[PDB]
Amino acid sequence: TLPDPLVGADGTRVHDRATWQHRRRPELLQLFAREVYGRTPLGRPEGMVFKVTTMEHAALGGAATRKEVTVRFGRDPNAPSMQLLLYVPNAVIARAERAPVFLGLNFYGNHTVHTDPAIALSARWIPAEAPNGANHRATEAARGSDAQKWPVEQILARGYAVATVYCGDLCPDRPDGLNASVASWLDAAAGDQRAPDAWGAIGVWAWGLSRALDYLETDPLVDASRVAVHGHSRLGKAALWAGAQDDRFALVISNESGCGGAALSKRIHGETVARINTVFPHWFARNFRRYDDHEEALPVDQHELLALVAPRPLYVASAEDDDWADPRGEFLAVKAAEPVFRLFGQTGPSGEDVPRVNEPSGGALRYHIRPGPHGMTAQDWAFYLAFADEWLKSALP
Ligand SMILES: CO[C@H]1[C@H](O)[C@@H](O)[C@@H](O[C@H]2[C@H](O[C@@H]3CO[C@@H](O)[C@H](O)[C@H]3O)OC[C@@H](O[C@@H]3OC[C@@H](O)[C@H](O)[C@H]3O)[C@@H]2O)O[C@@H]1C(=O)O
Ligand SMILES: [K+]
Ligand SMILES: [Mg+2]
């Protein structure tokens, strides 16, 4: 059975938004940091540098302004960096208005999100699984290879900018990637083994998303107060943790994030804690390994991570055949987080069990399940865009 988000660690019943925001949220944040994702050792580093390396006002046949930006995490040119790609809808810019933004990481490099031949090929290590990679280096045959997950033209046509960063800029997704990571640089522990409570890939990815947001604040073309942070699967685990830690994010989307994302760990279904740490030992804190086949001992579950987004709108979604992500456990996490959203006057899914396919349910706390296998599809995006329209525009200038 689940720990109650609205009962403090000392048994105090949380009945008001101030106690939630100033006592219970820090408690839960610290528990997830120590026991699941590992500690984020700092937020914004001193000396971040933003360098716009390319800027095309007539990208995508004139539909967008495209910018590529090197976001460096310190002033020394020897500091680590990530490469941000930004498409801004020219229809909005031309009205002298700032665009809201969808922001999320990509799996295989910025050049894979769109065929746009002007995108810089990632110069970083790319996993063997990437489509049409050669020797773990980016090739131009990989251009647009992950475009199915990225309906850029539709997003732009609906009035949103699209921003993305390759997750491997921050931590290459391989069990040894943390030694070639942002974590490796910030790790001043001269020692070898990362500490038990030290962050892994998901914490490093989530931190990169907040650094992307830092950049968007400075970019005059976009409204960084209206950023929807989104991710698919492992990068949706990152999007949830980024959205929970960084309340500047206006809206958070978890597309089939599964185990250690939206799915309840204490529900033993599909991927389990032991399975995810065995296969992906770099993703979480070593402390999370304490809960291998010991989920009953977890002091939190993922409904409390969802609750860390409240009262900002949160969308959790599943795929019908995606048993490994445990769709029912993702839905039940939403339902167990709902009392925190309700504390702030927001509403979650109507009813007690999984809604029917392609029938989203909920107010600011929303869920859908779509037909088909694990993935991120045009149907998901259709629902996300309607959600963003409601929460980043409705009664807004
Ligand atoms: C939910 O996000 C993550 C999961 O946390 C990961 O476990 C991983 O899940 C995928 C699974 O991954 C394998 C688990 O078994 C291990 O032995 C193996 O080494 C892992 O590679 O692979 C199957 C995949 O579902 C497939 O997705 C595509 C869909 O078209 C197919 O029908 C599915 O079978 C599952 O996601 O990766 C997840 C992620 O996407 O980040
Ligand atoms: K801005
Ligand atoms: Mg599970």
Measured by CA distance, the residue closest to atom 40 of ligand 1 is 233
Task: Tell me the pairing of strands 81-89 and 161-166.
Answer: antiparallel
Q: Tell me, yes or no, if 233 is annotated catalytic.
A: yes
Write the single-letter amino acid at 96. A
CB-based contacts of 248, cutoff 8 Å, min separation 6: 210, 213, 224, 225, 227
DSSP helix/strand/coil, 177: helix
Report whether 196 contacts 286 (CB < 8 A).
yes
Q: Which residues surround ligand 2, an ion (CB under 5 A)?
A: 219, 224
Find the angle CA(104)-CA(108)-CA(113) to the nearest 5 degrees: 60
Which residues' Cβ are closer than 6 Å to ligand 1?
233-234, 258-259, 271, 276, 279, 324-325, 373-375
Catalytic residue among 210, 233, 265, 361: 233
How far is Cα 14 from Cα 24, in angstroms, rounded to an integer?
8
Length of the chain: 397
Report whether 50 contacts 71 (CB < 8 A).
yes
Kindly give the number of the ligand 1 atom that is closest to the alpha carbon of 276: 7
Q: Which among 208, 185, 189 is positioned nearest to 197, based on CA atoms? A: 189
Burial 227-258 (b: 16+ CB within 10 A, else e): bbbbbbbbbbbbbbbbbbbbeebbbbbbbbbb
Task: Tell me the pairing of strands 251-255 and 222-232.
Answer: parallel
Q: Which among 232, 225, 185, 188 is positioned nearest to 204, based on CA atoms? A: 185
Return the sign of the alpha-carbon dihedral for residues 232, 237, 238, 242. positive
Task: Tell me the pairing of strands 161-166 and 222-232.
Answer: unpaired
Report whether 87 contacts 106 (CB < 8 A).
no
Q: Which among 196, 397, 346 is positioned nearest to 277, based on CA atoms? A: 196
Place of tokens 């991570």: 305
Environment class of 395 (CB within 10 Å of its CB; exposed 0-12, middle 13-18, buried 19+)? exposed
Provide the experimental method for this PDB entry. X-ray
Q: Which among 109, 141, 120 is positioned nearest to 51, based on CA atoms? A: 120
Place of tokens 């009664």: 395
Quick count: other Cβ atoms within 10 Å of Cβ 327? Answer: 26
How far is Cα 62 from Cα 371, in angstroms, rounded to an integer?
35
Q: 112: left (phi > 0), else alpha (psi -120 to 50), else beta?
A: alpha
Place of tokens 């037909």: 371
Burial 161-187 (b: 16+ CB within 10 A, else e): bbbbbbbbbbbbbbeebbebbbbeebb
DSSP 110-154: GGGS---TTSPPP-S---TTSTT-BTTB--GGGTTTTGGG--HHH
